[PDB]
Amino acid sequence: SGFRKMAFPSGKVEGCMVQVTCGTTTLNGLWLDDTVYCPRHVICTAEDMLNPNYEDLLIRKSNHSFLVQAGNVQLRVIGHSMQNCLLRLKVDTSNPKTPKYKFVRIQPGQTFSVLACYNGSPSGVYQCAMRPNHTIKGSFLNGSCGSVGFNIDYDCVSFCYMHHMELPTGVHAGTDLEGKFYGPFVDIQTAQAAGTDTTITLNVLAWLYAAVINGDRWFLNRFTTTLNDFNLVAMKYNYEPLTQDHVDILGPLSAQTGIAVLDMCAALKELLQNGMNGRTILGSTILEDEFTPFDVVRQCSGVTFQ
Amino acid sequence: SGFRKMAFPSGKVEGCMVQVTCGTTTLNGLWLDDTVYCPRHVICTAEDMLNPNYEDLLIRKSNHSFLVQAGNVQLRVIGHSMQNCLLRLKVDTSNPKTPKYKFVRIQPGQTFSVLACYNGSPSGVYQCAMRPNHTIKGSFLNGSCGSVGFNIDYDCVSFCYMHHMELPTGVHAGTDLEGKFYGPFVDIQTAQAAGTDTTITLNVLAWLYAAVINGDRWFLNRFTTTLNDFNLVAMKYNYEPLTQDHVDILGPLSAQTGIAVLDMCAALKELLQNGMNGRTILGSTILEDEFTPFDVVRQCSGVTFQ
Ligand SMILES: *C(=O)[C@H](Cc1cnc[nH]1)NC[C@@H]1C[C@H]2CCCC[C@@H]2CN1C(=O)c1ccc(-c2ccccc2)cc1
Numbered sequence: 362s363g364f365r366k367m368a369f370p371s372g373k374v375e376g377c378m379v380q381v382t383c384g385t386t387t388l389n390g391l392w393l394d395d396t397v398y399c400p401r402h403v404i405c406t407a408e409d410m411l412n413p414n415y416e417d418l419l420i421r422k423s424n425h426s427f428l429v430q431a432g433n434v435q436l437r438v439i440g441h442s443m444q445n446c447l448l449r450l451k452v453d454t455s456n457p458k459t460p461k462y463k464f465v466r467i468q469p470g471q472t473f474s475v476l477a478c479y480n481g482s483p484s485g486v487y488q489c490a491m492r493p494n495h496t497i498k499g500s501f502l503n504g505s506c507g508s509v510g511f512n513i514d515y516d517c518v519s520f521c522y523m524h525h526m527e528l529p530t531g532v533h534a535g536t537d538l539e540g541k542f543y544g545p546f547v548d549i550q551t552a553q554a555a556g557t558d559t560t561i562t563l564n565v566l567a568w569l570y571a572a573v574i575n576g577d578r579w580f581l582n583r584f585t586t587t588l589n590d591f592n593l594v595a596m597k598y599n600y601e602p603l604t605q606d607h608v609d610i611l612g613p614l615s616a617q618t619g620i621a622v623l624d625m626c627a628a629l630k631e632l633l634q635n636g637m638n639g640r641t642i643l644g645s646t647i648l649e650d651e652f653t654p655f656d657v658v659r660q661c662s663g664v665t666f667q
Numbered sequence: 668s669g670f671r672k673m674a675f676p677s678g679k680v681e682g683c684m685v686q687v688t689c690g691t692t693t694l695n696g697l698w699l700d701d702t703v704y705c706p707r708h709v710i711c712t713a714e715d716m717l718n719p720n721y722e723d724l725l726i727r728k729s730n731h732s733f734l735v736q737a738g739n740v741q742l743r744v745i746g747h748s749m750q751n752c753l754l755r756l757k758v759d760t761s762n763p764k765t766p767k768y769k770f771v772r773i774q775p776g777q778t779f780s781v782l783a784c785y786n787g788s789p790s791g792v793y794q795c796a797m798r799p800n801h802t803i804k805g806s807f808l809n810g811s812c813g814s815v816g817f818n819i820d821y822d823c824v825s826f827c828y829m830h831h832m833e834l835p836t837g838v839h840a841g842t843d844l845e846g847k848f849y850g851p852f853v854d855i856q857t858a859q860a861a862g863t864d865t866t867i868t869l870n871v872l873a874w875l876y877a878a879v880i881n882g883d884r885w886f887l888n889r890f891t892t893t894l895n896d897f898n899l900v901a902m903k904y905n906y907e908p909l910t911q912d913h914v915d916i917l918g919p920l921s922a923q924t925g926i927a928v929l930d931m932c933a934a935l936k937e938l939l940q941n942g943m944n945g946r947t948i949l950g951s952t953i954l955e956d957e958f959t960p961f962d963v964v965r966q967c968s969g970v971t972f973q
């Protein structure tokens with residue numbers, strides 16, 4: 362029993378974290394095999410960035426313009442190339458701790474674990490959702506660039522996020538590991554703001570289901586709703602509209618609990634309309650939206666408490 | 668910027684997690700050097716436990732009564748002894764991934780990271796406080812026994828918790844790694860309840876300070892308080908009394924922000940008395956009490972935002 366935001370165990374990622382220096386800028390990179398990945402802005406000086414041309418900035422560098430260090434070993438760069446907003450540095454040593462892995466572009470609402478790193482040294486791990494506005498509410502200080510976000514299935518690490526910058530609201534932006542930003546952001550130090558965000562309706566519902574699997578039914582009701590009537594209520598409260606595809610994804614949770622999705626939808630609508638009345642769900646006073654249906658199934662018991 | 672409950676990177680602990688089987692009971696153990704630690708209740712059958720005598724149960728076992736497996740290697744037990752509520756199994760192989768480490772008995776209010784494990788295989792990591800009632804609000808299912816709680820300083824892992832059982836309220840109990848329970852609990856399947864808990868006042872204050880370091884001052888006020896007047900208010904709201912020692916511990920946070928402890932105390936008292944008025948602190952609607960002063964300093968910037 363219990364329900365906690367839970368990260369994946371970070372050791373397989375820890376063994377891939379290096380330090381990458383270009384000039385007087387130091388930041389993280391991810392060492393897989395004989396490649397190191399890192400933000401391409403490592404090659405900028407506080408001046409260049411206001412308006413950088415990365416093609417023109419990079420052609421000015423050589424292999425020995427970059428220093429890569431793993432623990433206290435120095436790795437020698439023998440190649441380099443740009444891929445969207447990342448650099449790929451080829452190194453003379455293949456990482457012997459490289460895990461089975463792949464790169465994935467994660468979708469909005471999905472969650473992942475972040476290994477916060479400084480100077481190539483892992484410092485902490487927490488769990489994050491990709492917000493609908495393509496930002497993450499992370500915890501990051503200067504030097505955290507190139508820290509990665511990942512999920513682990515079996516022995517395989519699916520990397521999905523590399524940190525590049527903080528936005529003026531204090532939220533974070535970055536790329537997949539093909540160097541494509543999440544959201545309409547760019548790696549320039551300019552005026553750049555997060556667009557308006559929405560609550561992740563599907564996650565709210567998944568978490569309602571966790572609460573029933575864990576033994577709590579107080580917020581249920583005798584009513585049902587159409588998908589469409591649910592959505593008029595959703596827009597009023599700034600929730601993402603619910604789609605038939607989201608309804609489908611809730612099938613397994615619906616089945617474990619015997620509560621119809623749309624019956625849970627009506628529960629949610631009553632909650633949005635009336636409040637929680639001083640009560641909690643799973644220890645929370647607020648409706649929680651950063652646990653996916655997958656996260657609820659992974660964490661919760663397969664047997665419902667009653 | 669940001670503020671997240673953040674766990675320590677779990678890799679150094681992952682490399683110590685094994686599976687320990689006695690009879691038909693399987694649960695975790697912690698492999699350091701040539702010893703495996705685990706809950707001594709692994710030797711019980713659902714029957715024995717209702718009223719076990721562990722001395723009498725253990726003398727009935729041999730070394731080959733226990734099976735220890737690390738990944739897919741079988742480790743051979745060559746010795747065993749009881750230490751309070753743990754077994755120490757001596758094994759024929761010393762863990763080559765043993766980190767620098769020690770064992771610590773953590774104090775109430777203090778926090779640590781838990782590596783949730785099943786069948787010797789790490790599944791997740793989250794952060795926990797030791798509640799004042801000596802329970803943890805964990806997330807654990809059957810088979811999680813022998814999962815450990817730890818902190819990491821430099822390269823050294825301070826283990827402080829091994830999981831033994833779940834209580835009827837859904838909270839968790841366990842031991843330090845000398846096998847002494849935290850709290851008045853025992854490893855018997857009997858009626859056993861968590862005593863009344865209190866909010867960890869010191870943590871509340873530390874988190875108020877995080878919010879100011881991060882740039883938010885809205886809940887401050889022009890008032891001050893005596894320690895003693897603060898405490899009459901504290902008892903009314905079920906907060907732990909604040910002591911001069913707690914006041915001292917807040918010194919560094921007080922100094923970084925220029926807000927006197929007792930001025931923060933008066934801020935807190937007004938918050939308890941009036942509520943948060945629909946507002947949030949650090950994204951929370953509620954007063955948060957599972958970040959220590961140390962946790963705030965570790966995570967927050969050393970330069971206050973204004
Ligand atoms: C990376 O470590 C940080 C991440 C962060 C900070 N706080 C929270 N998260 N971001 C780097 C930050 C923003 C990016 C955006 C894209 C262009 C580069 C710019 C770099 N940057 C800086 O603040 C920065 C300022 C100045 C310098 C610098 C370089 C040479 C000489 C003097 C200064 C480098 C980076």
Ligand SMILES: *C(=O)[C@H](Cc1cnc[nH]1)NC[C@@H]1C[C@H]2CCCC[C@@H]2CN1C(=O)c1ccc(-c2ccccc2)cc1
Pocket residue numbers: 362691692694708711712713714716807808809810811812831832833853854855856
């Ligand atoms: C350990 O894995 C779980 C931890 C847990 C479960 N949910 C959340 N956290 N606790 C084991 C649980 C409680 C302890 C208390 C101390 C005495 C032993 C008892 C073991 N236990 C059981 O539920 C349990 C029941 C039955 C058996 C069993 C043994 C042999 C044959 C049939 C059954 C073993 C453990």
